[PDB]
Symmetry: D2
Subunit: 349 residues, 4 copies
């Protein structure tokens, strides 16, 4: 029952200022941190060989887009490899991002592993040596980080063990990040797979997020220096009932209002399986929801910002500006959506 | 991980409507629910005998003040006895309250009991047969309830057992109230006794409230149909260090922003040991605090609304209007304070 | 992390001595504590009116059986009414029990109540005023108590909430009993209803018992002064697969070896839906199970000791000796079974 | 509320048989798994240079003692390096251990790390890639593993966070081991530092162990295929009050009887700060305690088995026979103590 402060006032200020910079009005996050296994599939989807040089070129493609994205992008998440690559002009990518007014982020988790005794559930590893990696990433230009936990809605899932363990590892990761001046993004993703309906996803999301923020409290996490990266509340991919974007927005906002303390600086949704345009409408509806939302509601999009750019690129160097244009389109679209400015019964929740 | 709805949409709307009526702008709660053992202390302090008649008269004195209190008082909490008494004009007190535009509340707990193996810590009893009582109180005009848990800041307290146990019984009480159409006020009071400083009270309050709302989630409580009745974050009564009202307001709003989900309809502060004027000033500073506060921040005052009325009464029949005037003063003062309209480095928190 | 002892060594000795007397070798408990609503059903099965006198006579019939039961019955559980009734010769029933070498027990819970938001699950009430009741029961001759919690195996049950809440209320009850020199019997009954198999029951029983003993630790319960009243591990009533008595015994002892600390003085199984002969055979098989069992394994039987006696009685005063003989037969049978002397691989668990 | 079995019956049998071999009557564990930084302190204490060869030689010294230790030693815990070193006759140390009737163990954690917001409390790291390491150690002859968590008795410690977090990481480590056919030794150590008395240690030990076994239940651990490595219940190093060996035994057995389920196969005590003889006397008292003890109560000793051997060696190759004799003495002493045959309600 006695306080042994984890952070000084100066440390708290740095973390709060970083978090606010990332989700400042009209701004969101580009998730360009696809692991080397995940980036392989993207390149194979456009028949391009997965070489370090192709990965560098594609990342450079997104980071050097014209200055129209500067007011759209508050932060860019990178994979380890990309953090130490350089643009053609010799500038390290963290410097490119900074010079366009962005914060640099680093994904630090090491993937999921199975939880024995469960119905195919997982936790996430990566805590070993994390403090030294974070101190190193801080030196090399990173100011926030990402850690992804995965949960699945099934007949017996997510179980009490899975929720508790994923919530606990998220808190540990957040604790280590804040000790090294890094803002942790807490991502408890509930997959959209299955035939569950909207209200079931809302129920599960509410139970996961309540576990998350109890754990963050237990581990003394400074919420003003955190961000939340949740799934939107949506029906399962295999659900037959159809829902309006207004219903998606109402259920999403409702789940957050019931679990996310106001001290959290911002919520940066993941797009999941949504299409580029679907992810922009939904995010816009969420910001038009009449209910009171005491946190920034913006984006941390990977595919929903890159899908078109990747295809217009096709691996051909001469399609550089055509691909950048598709990326700039989505960045401008979602900069409007996270302000509710995008145009192409609460008791029931 | 499967939903079995505790409340229908129609039940939710009733509870939410009640909760909002109570904390509507400019309105607060009169706490006239002193148990017969506590009201005995009040009458003794003005040398008045503790008879049912004096208790009935004293309550009548407050409930029948002139219509300047109608926009100030959203709700009145009563003890069991008073709920079935009548004013001099024969009208049952619940009818008097409603006719003046107030909601009727009832205290339903049966006092504290010791927790074996702890250093003088307690839990609260009163769950047995609570559902049938609630159904009866509902019929007889009550629309919300009160339950008081007490925690103490000390060398080894509040302990993990004390926090877990009091949070859990509050959730049981709230669950039963909502099944019977009654809005539960959740009151986990941290006593101001001791020489602890402001930061220690803020730390305990943040830990206690995190446990409360995790327990409310585990028990499926509908937060829009609840109110929270917490202490303000203050130093101990015996703390040597001095603090401004702005500092108390900053500590209080920070603790709440870090724990209370936006879905909670209102926060009705208890006055504790504060004087009448001190309680109104602090509530006013709380409502002027620049930070974002997504709930109503109003009052549930007993002593802070009654102290002057009681002394002016003194048991004399002829001092009725002198006493009623002192109560109308405090009702008007606190109606202004809960709007920030009353005049007599956040990272360091 | 600081001990504030709940009990003195003298208090500990008293509780431990009571507990060992009850489950001394060859001894078990007669459960004659049916509520007036539960005993009414039994009387109706023999077309006998539910009057206080018939209830008195029936209880007298059991309590005054001939002295062949004295070494069989270490304790007798009574309902409130029966604790204050007298035999025909004027002797209070507690004195009847004590003079035959038994300990007097009292049922102290006030029945189950529904948990809102669950699939028909319950918790139990009765804590209100329990401390005053226990001290009074102690004065009037009772030395141990019983509290029944009920959990159900279903598609989504027992839930996390139901396990947590019932474990917590059992520990509260146990703490209060021990403060008044009363040995608590902790009864977390998992019902046999449903089509579940033996493995499913063993799993649930293991998780229930683990939660029970964690709660008892959190509440500072003295295990040597407690007894456990669990179900045997059995298939559901509606299960099609058939199991031998040796498999039931192996599953039961395995579940217990994995969850019950050796400090627990004894285990007094409930019979559930089992017949008189079935409950005796299983208990015998349990005590012959080759595994190591560091606690007494005996019986706390109601129907499995009374069924034949109740039928032979039929309400007729003249069937006294015929009825008593049937009760004595089962008491002698079960006294042999709890020693493994009654006659009418493990890695797969 | 639905079972998804973590282990098959075949997997349970393998784990149970391993665990029973390690703690078979008269047998205990030699803890020779000192990390490279801890063994550096040991060698420095006898003015010996910390070289791979010196570490190899010292470990060989212990593992090749004469066959009088065979009935005393059910298991040997090794550090990663030693697992892949060889004796002078070319045999890998795991083969040496097995040929003398012992089971090979491996330390798999990666040290303690601070818990932010606490008063100097720690958790332990080492889960990343533990499944692949365990599978590899199994191929290379290891059949059980060790993971150490450390807790401290202070004015505000151990806190709810530290107990919960350490209990949870222990359960994760135990879960991964059992999926790879390795018996986990669960070691939640409460340090003897401080001026606390016996009662305080008994209280803390009971709370820590209750949390450990709830965690292990939550994570579906097969207790019959696990071992416990706890401290003995003793007063703090700086406590003025004196206690007899019978009181230490009574407090230790009582703590265990109130927390450790009978299904656990064995309890292998750590020696902590105790001298070789103090550890042997206390272990003997524990095994003679009149209360009923449904698990093997033996030793997992490092310093309490090696102290005299290290000093008799002194780094000199010609003291090989002298050093080995001192080790065989303690192995014989403690093999008797864990049978209770060694002689030189208030809880
Ligand atoms: O679902 P897919 O179509 O296979 O594509 C994926 C899958 C997972 C991820 C993860 P990772 O980078 O850790 O692999 P994250 O979304 O957290 O970046 C990224 C892209
Ligand atoms: O501090 P005191 O001078 O003793 O006055 C008191 C003490 C307690 C209460 C309780 P109760 O009504 O349950 O007794 P509550 O604040 O909940 O009304 C009310 C007034
Ligand atoms: O099995 P049934 O036919 O429904 O009869 C019953 C049902 C419940 C009980 C309870 P109670 O006495 O508290 O009501 P307990 O098992 O605790 O004696 C006793 C007999
Ligand atoms: O107390 P010291 O004098 O510092 O010696 C020590 C300290 C710690 C250990 C650990 P480690 O080998 O993991 O560091 P373990 O007890 O687990 O072997 C071993 C020896």
């Amino acid at each position: 029952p006695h306080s042994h402060p984890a952070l000084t006032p100066e440390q708290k200020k740095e973390l709060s200022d970083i978090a606010h910079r990332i989700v400042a009005p009209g701004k969101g996050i580009l998730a360009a941190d696809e692991s080397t296994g995940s980036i392989a599939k993207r390149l194979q989807s456009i028949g391009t060989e997965n070489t370090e040089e192709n990965r560098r070129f594609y990342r450079q493609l997104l980071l050097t887009a014209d200055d129209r994205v500067n007011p759209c992008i508050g932060g860019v998440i990178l994979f380890h490899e990309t953090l130490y690559q350089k643009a053609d002009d010799g500038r390290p990518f963290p410097q490119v991002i900074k010079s366009k007014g962005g914060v640099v982020g680093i994904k630090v988790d090491k993937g999921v592993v199975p939880l024995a005794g469960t119905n195919g559930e997982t936790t996430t590893q990566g805590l070993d040596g994390l403090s030294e990696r974070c101190a190193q990433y801080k030196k090399d230009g990173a100011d926030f980080a990402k850690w992804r936990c995965v949960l699945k809605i099934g007949e017996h899932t997510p179980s009490a063990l899975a929720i508790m363990e994923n919530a606990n590892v998220l808190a540990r990761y957040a604790s280590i990040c804040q000790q090294n001046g890094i803002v942790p993004i807490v991502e408890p993703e509930i997959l959209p797979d299955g035939d569950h309906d909207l209200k079931r996803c809302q129920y599960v999301t509410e139970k996961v997020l309540a576990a998350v923020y109890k754990a963050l409290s237990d581990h003394h996490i400074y919420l003003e220096g955190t961000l939340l990266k949740p799934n939107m509340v949506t029906p399962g991919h295999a659900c037959t009932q159809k829902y309006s974007h207004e219903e998606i927005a109402m259920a999403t906002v409702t789940a957050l209002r019931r679990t996310v303390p106001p001290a959290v600086t911002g919520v940066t949704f993941l797009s999941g399986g949504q299409s580029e345009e679907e992810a922009s409408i939904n995010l816009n509806a969420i910001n038009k929801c009449p209910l009171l939302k005491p946190w920034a509601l913006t984006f941390s999009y990977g595919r929903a910002l890159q899908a078109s750019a990747l295809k217009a690129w096709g691996g051909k160097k001469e399609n550089l500006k055509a691909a950048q244009e598709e990326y700039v389109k989505r960045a401008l679209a979602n900069s409007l959506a996270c302000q509710g400015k995008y145009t192409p019964s609460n008791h029931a929740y």
